């Protein structure tokens, strides 16, 4: 009886998959035939074959879904900051406080290459910098770390250690990733969307 019930369940699954394959094949055919006309232009506006604009900007922002590192987010600031701290550890430079970190972030962000970047990404960078500065401030208040750099236990500076070189590296890496993760003009976004919905 148990073997017969298991065979019943197996045959149910088999016929379910058999119907699902055909249904999804037809749906994918329809979706691709409908969406194959769209394409990403050079002016960041997705237009159809007749010239009508479907979107003034793809996804509202213009980022490549294939180059999405985070969960529907361009970059994971925590992982990027950890990677920057690990790859470029500067032992000959002192740590930064909250005020110094905010000052150097504001001084670096106001450069020319950061002007062409989107405002939302800059606001997210500022928010992450403020958060990490608040974390460093809380750590230094818990352990009595002085911003002058004359504390006797230097190991206390190893809890949250940040140097302006690492700040510049992190900001440049984030800017480069955000620039390279944008929608490249000429890509057939409609076909990619149809396939990523049909599969």
């Amino acid at each position: 009886t148990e073997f017969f019930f298991h065979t019943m369940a197996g045959r149910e699954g088999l016929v379910d998959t058999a119907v699902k394959t055909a249904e999804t094949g037809y749906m994918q055919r329809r979706l691709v035939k409908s969406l194959e006309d769209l394409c990403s232009q050079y002016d960041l506006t997705v237009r159809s074959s007749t010239g009508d604009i479907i979107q003034f900007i793809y996804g509202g922002d213009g980022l490549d879904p294939a180059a999405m590192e985070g969960k529907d987010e361009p970059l994971e600031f925590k992982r990027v900051l950890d990677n920057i701290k690990a790859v470029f550890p500067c032992p000959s430079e002192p740590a930064l406080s909250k005020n110094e970190l905010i000052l150097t972030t504001e001084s670096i962000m106001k450069k020319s290459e950061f002007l062409c970047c989107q405002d939302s990404f800059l606001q997210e960078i500022k928010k992450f910098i403020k958060g990490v500065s608040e974390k460093i401030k809380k750590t230094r208040d818990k352990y009595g770390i002085n911003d002058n750099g004359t504390t006797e236990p230097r190991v206390l500076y190893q809890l949250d250690r940040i140097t302006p070189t690492q700040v510049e590296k992190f900001l440049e890496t984030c800017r480069d990733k955000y620039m390279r993760a944008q929608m490249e003009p000429g890509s057939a976004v409609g076909a990619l969307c149809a396939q990523s919905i049909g599969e």
């Binding site: 002016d43 506006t45 010239g51 009508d52 604009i53 479907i54 979107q55 003034f56 900007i57 509202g60 922002d61 529907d72 405002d119 939302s120 606001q123 997210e124």
Partner: protein, 209 residues
């Protein structure tokens, strides 16, 4: 009755005030923020309240564009508005020299009255609204984004920035609920601000066609 009917009337009046404030007409803060107690003070019973006459509004004027421009609102008492009521409203607007009118029906409009209202006159613009739709404000809905009708200068700047034409912009039907709420005509452009998942906003544009 006498409890839900007055509440519906007060909510419809508040929705009409919000619509007039969004369209740019002159409305004081008291009319916009009108509690149920003030409406009861005006009229607390259904037979005491006058739908065809006591609820009409004539002070609606476009203070931003021209105070001479006047807009009127009618509240027919009968469930289905006929040809005679439309003709009476039209002759009243002719006497009072009013070109823009809204008609808040109770249940619906007969097809003949609809067809007549469609081709009343190019100068006499009249918009029909069902009370069932006006019982809830479309703008305050979470799914409906913020819509702002752009002036001709903003439309020209938009067409110049992207080097586009009018017919290349996304279309929106005149029969759209938001379109009738704002009373936009063919050729006007509306900027829509969609709230994204992050702190940013997505700016799009639609042409009425």
């Amino acid at each position: 009755d006498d409890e839900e009917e007055t509440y519906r009337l007060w909510k419809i009046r508040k929705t009409i005030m919000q619509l007039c404030h969004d369209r740019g007409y002159l409305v004081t803060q008291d009319e916009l923020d009108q509690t149920l107690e003030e409406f009861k003070a005006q009229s607390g019973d259904k037979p005491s309240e006058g739908r065809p006459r006591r609820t009409d509004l004539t002070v609606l004027v476009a203070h931003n564009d021209d105070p001479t421009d006047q807009m009127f609102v009618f509240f027919p008492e009968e469930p289905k508005v006929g040809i005679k009521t439309i003709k009476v409203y039209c002759q009243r607007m002719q006497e009072e020299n009013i070109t823009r009118a809204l008609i808040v029906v109770q249940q619906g409009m007969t097809p003949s009255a609809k067809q007549s209202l469609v081709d009343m006159a190019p100068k006499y613009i009249l918009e029909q609204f069902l009370q069932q739709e006006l019982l809830i404000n479309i703008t305050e809905h979470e799914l409906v984004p913020e819509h702002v009708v752009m002036t001709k200068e903003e439309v020209t700047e938009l067409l110049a920035r992207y080097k586009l034409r009018e017919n290349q912009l996304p279309r929106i039907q005149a029969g759209d609920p938001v379109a009738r709420y704002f009373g936009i005509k063919r050729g006007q452009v509306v900027k829509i601000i969609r709230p994204s998942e992050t702190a940013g906003r997505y700016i799009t544009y639609r042409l009425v066609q």
